[PDB]
Amino acid sequence: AKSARASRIKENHQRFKKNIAGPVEAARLERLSAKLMAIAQASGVKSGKSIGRKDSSIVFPM
Amino acid sequence: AEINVEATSWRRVEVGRVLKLENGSLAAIVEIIDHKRVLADGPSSDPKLATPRGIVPLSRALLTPIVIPKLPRGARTGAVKKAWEAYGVDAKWKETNWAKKQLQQERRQSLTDFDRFKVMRLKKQRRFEERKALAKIKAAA
Amino acid sequence: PSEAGHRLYVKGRHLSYQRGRRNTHPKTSLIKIEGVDDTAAANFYLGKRVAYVYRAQKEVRGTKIRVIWGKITRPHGNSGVVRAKFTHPLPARSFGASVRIMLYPSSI
Amino acid sequence: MRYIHSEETIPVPENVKVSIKSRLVTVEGPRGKLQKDLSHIAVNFSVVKKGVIGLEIHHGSRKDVAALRTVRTIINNMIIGVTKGFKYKMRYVYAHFPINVNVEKNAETGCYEVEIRNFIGEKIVRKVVMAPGVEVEISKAQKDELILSGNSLEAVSQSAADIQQICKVRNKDIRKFLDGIYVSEKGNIV
Amino acid sequence: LRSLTTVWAEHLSDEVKRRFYKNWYKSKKKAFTKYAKKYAENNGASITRELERIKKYCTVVRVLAHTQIRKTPLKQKKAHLMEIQINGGSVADKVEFGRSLFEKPVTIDTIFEKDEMIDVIAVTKGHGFVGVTARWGTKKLPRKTHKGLRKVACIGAWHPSHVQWTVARAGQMGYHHRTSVNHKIYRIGKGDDEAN
Amino acid sequence: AGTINKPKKPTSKRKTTRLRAKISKRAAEKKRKERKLARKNPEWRSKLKKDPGIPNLFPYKERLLQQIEEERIRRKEEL
Amino acid sequence: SSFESVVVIDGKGHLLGRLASIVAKQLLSGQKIVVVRCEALNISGEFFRAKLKYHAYLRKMTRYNPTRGGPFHFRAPSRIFYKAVRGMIPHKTARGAAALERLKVFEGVPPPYDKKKKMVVPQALRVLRLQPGRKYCTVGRLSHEVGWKYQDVVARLEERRKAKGAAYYERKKLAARQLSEAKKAAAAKVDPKVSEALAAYGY
Amino acid sequence: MGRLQEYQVIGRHLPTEANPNPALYRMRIFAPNEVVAKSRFWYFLRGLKKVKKATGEIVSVNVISEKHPLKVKNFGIWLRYDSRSGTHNMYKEYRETSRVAAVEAMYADMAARHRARFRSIHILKVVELEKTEDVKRPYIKQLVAKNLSFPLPHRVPKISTKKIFSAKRPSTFS
RNA sequence: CAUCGGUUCUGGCGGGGGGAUAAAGGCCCAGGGAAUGUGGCUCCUCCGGGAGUGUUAUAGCCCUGGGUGUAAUACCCUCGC
RNA sequence: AACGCGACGAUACUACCCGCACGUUGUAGACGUAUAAGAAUAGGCUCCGGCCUCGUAUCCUAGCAGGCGAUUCCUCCGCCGGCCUCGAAGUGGCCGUCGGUAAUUCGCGUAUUGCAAUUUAGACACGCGCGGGAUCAAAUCCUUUGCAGACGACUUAGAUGUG
Known part of the structure; x- marks a missing residue:
């Protein structure tokens, strides 16, 4: 028997993933993302656009 | 047929090539013994640049830009000296940047405490002038 | 005002005692002087006094800083390391600590 | 023994441009550009003469002297x-x-692809991707012949070898089962 | 991977605030009360700055989400909180998506679909302290074996002069973390459907 | 072999005192036994060993042969 | 010799054991050492020999319990260099532990060492030590092949650091050009006796 | 093997009533000093003429200096050396400025290439090759070529071993 | 710290002797010789350089004897500071 | 990793933060504890003129351990603030105010620590003080639960409630 780690089995599974399961999973992902997107859509320093600083050591103390 | 080759251009050990030894003296290759040793003679009238005729290991020598033209292989000290003064090896060595670096090294090594103090003060005066010039340049652009 | 330092000594490091493979002899220490890398350079510092300066807990006679004094005795090896003899042997914990090599007694 | 000096030469035709910088060789012709990094070999390149490249090794052993022959043939x-x-x-x-045998050109990658079907009645489809720069055509002059052409000899011959090795008979007597795809001719396009 | 910053929503429910407490009934319930003021101060400048930091520096974005445990028949009132990764899109898309999902309920059918195979992660049933026969499936020793039969006869017969880590020993069984894969979803039933 | 990915047990180059002493003893015994066999050797040995001669690549071999001729002629004349 | 507060060493192109020996001696003498770019260290000989040695190392583990006492096989390149250094230090003594606390090793160049001077050790440099034609390998490649997970992250971070270094180098070249122009313009305004005395002293 | 000198050693058998004037024997010995030179002389004489040290005397020991130590020469050395197989003839060539330098280079060469130590080597002839056409070995023939000139690629610069750290990566081009 | 004594490590300087009264070497004198043959000359060329001829010419080298010369220096031994 | 790390919430006090006021407080060891290209090494660098063995370099370096007053100079340094900028273990640039400041020259002071004795001088951390600014928290026992359990431990609940 060819093992689950066999190269031929991996190549067979890659062809299956690319040609058969892939489009089905992509279409399901499109539907789910559309539903959750519908749910979701239902001075620099003083404004925070400029990212200023928030309000054991890598070096020797010197 | 267009050929563009960009590679190294080493200086070559050859008869007539002037070597600088580790003590600062100069010699000229008279005969190549093997890939590691040469026979060399420095007939310079300057005692600092002079070298007795003898075997020089190339690991202890550096190749200068100067090559004495048409120096015969195996030439004795008289002919080597005649070619040396005819070509003017000492003057060209003085114009090389290696000898200027060596001269600067000896000038800095011969400084006394008063000399170092005066060096610092004169350098500060010159540095004040260069700082004004740099401020003017940076103000322009 | 002045922006210069005040150092009149040469920096050194206390490396080890005089030792073989296994046996050590604390009566003589080995010192690496800064910038001294040969026996000829080490010959300048022979007889120079060397201080190991350290800190204690209790303040005794105005200070917490204690000193062990010694002298440079002879060169060691070929790389400018010197042997030094102190009044008391230096602490074994101070392997890698700093010492001050004075410019006295001077012969210049 | 160490040989003081050893040298090879490469003639360059009139329509070719050769540029060598830090042992990275670029060759220009009517048919395109090839590049090859030769910095794993110690060699000094020079222009000895108009239209001649010089290759030299200094103070080399016999092995280092012999390596220049490989460098010469590679550049040639x-x-x-x-x-x-x-x-x-x-x-x-x-x-x-x-x-x-069906031959396609992948528009995304630019490479040719060869699909082989019905090899001794097998149902699997064998797919070989050609090296970039190798063109594959089904011949019209002769029966059951593919033609792989390009500028890089290594790319062409390796593509041919990949096609040769993908159609291997297994667990059968090869005195009897003669099916396969074999290299039948090697040469120049021009 | 390193967590750079987190941004919280303006309003958090009591069921998720209970997760930050051991003695919520005695508490002053002060958690996030100073944090909620950053939405009002300077028109939310600190919130905006942390969102921009996530947009420009981060590669992985995860939402924080909690259960509504009060809609279950469980006596527990303290909700479960977890990080759920947003996959797909650019980092700016992930950040805008999560900020749009702030304070909102996400139903199970917007994440999973019928006929999908999923993975289930949980801690298994606890069994307490268990001998080797039920813990490891070893063969029982014969009847009235001296010093017990629900044991392993020789835990060591050979060198080293140690018990090895690969020998079966009595100890805790169950309450282990397990990830089980490839579980098919047969139905996603809706709670408002009287015929689900 | 798969030596690089899965190396086997190393062969130790650290000797033991027992093996060192045993090897030294066997070497000394072999030296004694070889001396005894050389003393009782029945194989014929030449009184004078065969000389290799002069190497051909020596550039003055012909001159050395001339000197040998001259020396033997002078010896024959003197005797 | 020279005593420094801390010596930062660029680990690129250095031979592992020779650098480790020099670093261990400096640590025991009392000098603080930071080594960066440990993924760019070199090991002489072919890569498969280094791989064989690391797999032979991976063979060894405490038989009765691999969680205690066993040789813990660290796969990061800085940890490979750290193991090489620790083998040349009496680490089971207090002095050896104190010497090991004076060392830091990193993959890549994390800040603030990106803006610090990085030194080289010529007695351990591969271009100066190895005979031409001899094979050598990279510790980073060895680490990646035995299970270090962060080769690509370090490579991207090094790429951003080198782009910022390119910008800094453009500014540095502009500053050097302006300094040369300033000295040339100021040479007219310095007193000629001052200039001649400085030249005679060698400045 | 060592800083060698060439010695002329002349010795003889002690005179007797039958032989009032014994023959004198001369050898050229390469040796570090005079004690070693006389010991080697008696060793070879015992091997050749069966004259022992106790029954003989040393007549003269002199140093033979090189006539032209500043002239590059090619040397042919004929030697015999002893190995596990036996005694082997060997002809080798050296490009030196003196016979003693050639013999030292021979000793180092025999040690490096055949593990032949000092007492297993018998030097039979050291000749200065008079003409360029007398050179037989290609490793000397490539050195005596017309207009010989070579570069020195990949020269490691000399840095003091006491300077541990450098602020600049060195170059190997000079 | 200065002046001493004992032991010892280390640096520098001035002399004397030996050997082939070092061997070399420089500058002269008188012979002899060749090539990895200089100049010249001849023939080919990619005009860059090659091949040939022959003994100093528009470079030089090797060997022998002699003078300076009891030259210098190395090495070894040695008297001191 | 129970002596590896990160983000976040609330943090009562003698807790937190700011200022200066110092330590018979500590630290494998301050004394100018100054200095970022990358890359190749059978090749590189550049201001495009040239340059490359070499850090034997460059910067800085004078004054009571560095005073006071002038002459003189617009150079260098520092604290703050604004705008940007820096996520590999996050900090630099510009501008502005303020303060200091021999590049030149001079005046008054230095003694007596007695012929040397660490040159008590730095950084980080910790602590005791005041004078201010800011903040009013949790955990455990206990009772309870059984998704747990030998005992500890764990999941829960206990403050008005969908208890």
Whole structure:
């Protein structure tokens, strides 16, 4: 028997993933993302656009 | 047929090539013994640049830009000296940047405490002038 | 005002005692002087006094800083390391600590 | 023994441009550009003469002296590639099941792809991707022949070898089962 | 991977605030009360700055989400909180998506679909302290074996002069973390459907 | 072999005192036994060993042969 | 010799054991050492020999319990260099532990060492030590092949650091050009006796 | 093997009533000093003429200096050396400025290439090759070529071993 | 710290002797010789350089004897500071 | 990793933060504890003129351990603030105010620590003080639960409630 780690089995599974399961999973992902997107859509320093600083050591103390 | 080759251009050990030894003296290759040793003679009238005729290991020598033209292989000290003064090896060595670096090294090594103090003060005066010039340049652009 | 330092000594490091493979002899220490890398350079510092300066807990006679004094005795090896003899042997914990090599007694 | 000096030479044709910088060799011809990094070999390059490249080794052993012959032939092959090209003809033969070979060009990658079907009646589709720069065509002059052409001899011959190795008979007597795809001719395009 | 910053929503429910407490009934319930003021101060400048930091520096974005445990028949009132990764899109898309999902309920059918195979992660049933026969499936020793039969006869017969880590020993069984894969979803039933 | 990915047990180059002493003893015994066999050797040995001669690549071999001729002629004349 | 507060060493192109020996001696003498770019260290000989040695190392583990006492096989390149250094230090003594606390090793160049001077050790440099034609490998490649997970992250971070270094180098070249122009313009305004005395002293 | 000198050693058998004037024997010995030179002389004489040290005397020991130590020469050395197989003839060539330098280079060469130590080597002839056409070995023939000139690629610069750290990566081009 | 004594490590300087009264070497004198043959000359060329001829010419080298010369220096031994 | 790390919430006090006021407080060891290209090494650098063995370099370096007053100079340094900028273990640039400041020259002071004795001088951390600014928290026992359990431990609940 060819093992689950066999190269031929991996190549067979890659062809299956690319040609058969892939489009089905992509279409399901499109539907789910559309539903959750519908749910979701239902001075620099003083404004925070400029990212200023928030309000054991890598070096020797010197 | 267009050929563009960009590679190294080493200086070559050859008869007539002037070597600088580790003590600062100069010699000229008279005969190549093997890939590691040469026979060399420095007939310079300057005692600092002079070298007795003898075997020089190339690991202890550096190749200068100067090559004495048409120096015969195996030439004795008289002919080597005649070619040396005819070509003017000492003057060209003085114009090389290696000898200027060596001269600067000896000038800095011969400084006394008063000399170092005066060096610092004169350098500060010159540095004040260069700082004004740099401020003017940076103000322009 | 002045922006210069005040150092009149040469920096050194206390490396080890005089030792073989296994046996050590604390009566003589080995010192690496800064910038001294040969026996000829080490010959300048022979007889120079060397201080190991350290800190204690209790303040005794105005200070917490204690000193062990010694002298440079002879060169060691070929790389400018010197042997030094102190009044008391230096602490074994101070392997890698700093010492001050004075410019006295001077012969210049 | 260490030899003081050893040298090889490469002639360059009139329509070729050779640029060497830090042992990275670029060869220019009518058919395109080839590049090859030769910095794993100690060699000094020079222009000895108009239209001649010089290769030299200083103070080298016999092995280092011998390596210059490989360097010479490699650069000569790049020159031949940009001038005349390289062409490998392969023939596929069968006994009972006709081998079907289909050739496509991937627009995304730019590489050619060869699909082989019905190899001794097998149902799997064998797919070989050609090296970039190798063109594959089904011949019209001869029966059951593929033609792989390009500038890089290594790319062409390795593509041909990949096609040769993908159609391997297994667990059968090879005195009897003669199906396969074999390199039948090697040469130049021009 | 390193967590650079987190941004919280303006309003958090009591069921998720209970997760930050051991003695919520005695508490002053002060958690996030100073944090909620950053939405009002300077028109939310600190919130905006942390969102921009996530947009420009981060590669992985995860939402924080909690259960509504009060809609279950469980006596527990303290909700479960977890990080759920947003996959797909650019980092700016992930950040805008999560900020749009702030304070909102996400139903199970917007994440999973019927006929999908999923993975289930949980801690298994606890069994307490268990001998080797039920813990490891070893063969029982014969009847009235001296010093017990629900044991392993020789835990060591050979060198080293140690018990090895690969020998079966009595100890805790169950309450282990397990990830089980490839579980098919047969139905996603809706709670408002009287015929689900 | 798969030596690089899965190397086997190393062969130690650290000797033991027992093996060192045993090897030294066997070497000394072999030296004694070889001396005894050389003393009782029945194989014929030449009184004078065969000389290799002069190497051909020596550039003055012909001159050395001339000197040998001259020396033997002078010896014959003196005797 | 020279005593420094801390010596930062660029680990690129250095031979592992020779650098480790020099670093261990400096640590025991009392000098603080930071080594960066440990993924760019070199090991002489072919890569498969280094791989064989690391797999032979991976063979060894405490038989009765691999969680205690066993040789813990660290796969990061800085940890490979750290193991090489620790083998040349009496680490089971207090002095050896104190010497090991004076060392830091990193993959890549994390800040603030990106803006610090990085030194080289010529007695351990591969271009100066190895005979031409001899094979050598990279510790980073060895680490990646035995299970270090962060080769690509370090490579991207090094790429951003080198782009910022390119910008800094453009500014540095502009500053050097302006300094040369300033000295040339100021040479007219310095007193000629001052200039001649400085030249005679060698400045 | 060592800083060698060439010695002329002349010795003889002690005179007797039958032989009032014994023959004198001269050898050229390469040796570090005079004690070693006389010991080697008696060793070879015992091997050749069966004259022992106790029954003989040393007549003269002199140093033979090189006539032209500043002239590059090619040397042919004929030697015999002892190995596990036996005694082997060997002809080798050296490009030196003196016979003693050639013999030292021979000793180092025999040690490096055949592990032949000092007492297993018998030097039979050291000749200065008069003409360029007398050179037989290619490793000397490539050195005596017309207009010989070579570069020195990949020269490691000399840095003091006491300077541990450098602020600049060195170059190997000079 | 200065002046001493004992032991010892280390640096520098001035002399004397030996050997082939070092061997070399420089500058002269008188012979002899060749090539990895200089100049010249001849023939080919990619005009860059090659091949040939022959003994100093528009470079030089090797060997022998002699003078300066009891030259210098190395090495070894040695008297001191 | 129970002596590896990160983000976040609330943090009562003698807790937190700011200022200066110092330590018979500590630290494998301050004393100018100054200095970022990358890359190749059978090749590189550049201001495009040239340059490359070499850090034997460059910067800085004078004054009571560095005073006071002038002459003189617009150079260098520092604290703050604004705008940007820096996520590999996050900090630099510009501008502005303020303060200091021999590049030149001079005046008054230095003694007596007695012929040397660490040159008590730095950084980080910790602590005791005041004078201010800011903040009013949790955990455990206990009772309870059984998704747990030998005992500890764990999941829960206990403050008005969908208890």
